[PDB]
């Protein structure tokens, strides 16, 4: 359903505890693939296979997915 991916830069360190979650450090640029629910994005690290979900509150949203 998404027509344009978004992007964000991490503003907090996030340790995912499960396979569905994507860990990252402050400063990592993340492509936003979709908003999963009220609290989580699915994203990916550009040029890689790191993909999974993380909390919206842990990133600075530059562009929302459309």
């Amino acid at each position: 359903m998404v027509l344009e991916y978004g992007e964000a830069i991490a503003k907090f360190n996030f340790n995912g505890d499960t396979q569905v979650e994507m860990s990252f450090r402050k400063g990592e640029r993340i492509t936003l693939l979709r908003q999963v629910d009220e609290n989580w994005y699915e994203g990916r690290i550009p040029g890689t296979s790191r993909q999974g979900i993380f909390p919206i509150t842990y990133v600075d949203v530059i562009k929302r997915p459309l």
């Binding site: 907090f12 360190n13 499960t18 569905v20 609290n39 989580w40 979900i53 909390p55 509150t57 842990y58």
Partner: peptide
């Protein structure tokens, strides 16, 4: 130090 982790999606 970070915001509390929200509950996971369904």
């Amino acid at each position: 130090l970070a915001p509390p982790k929200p509950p996971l999606p369904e």
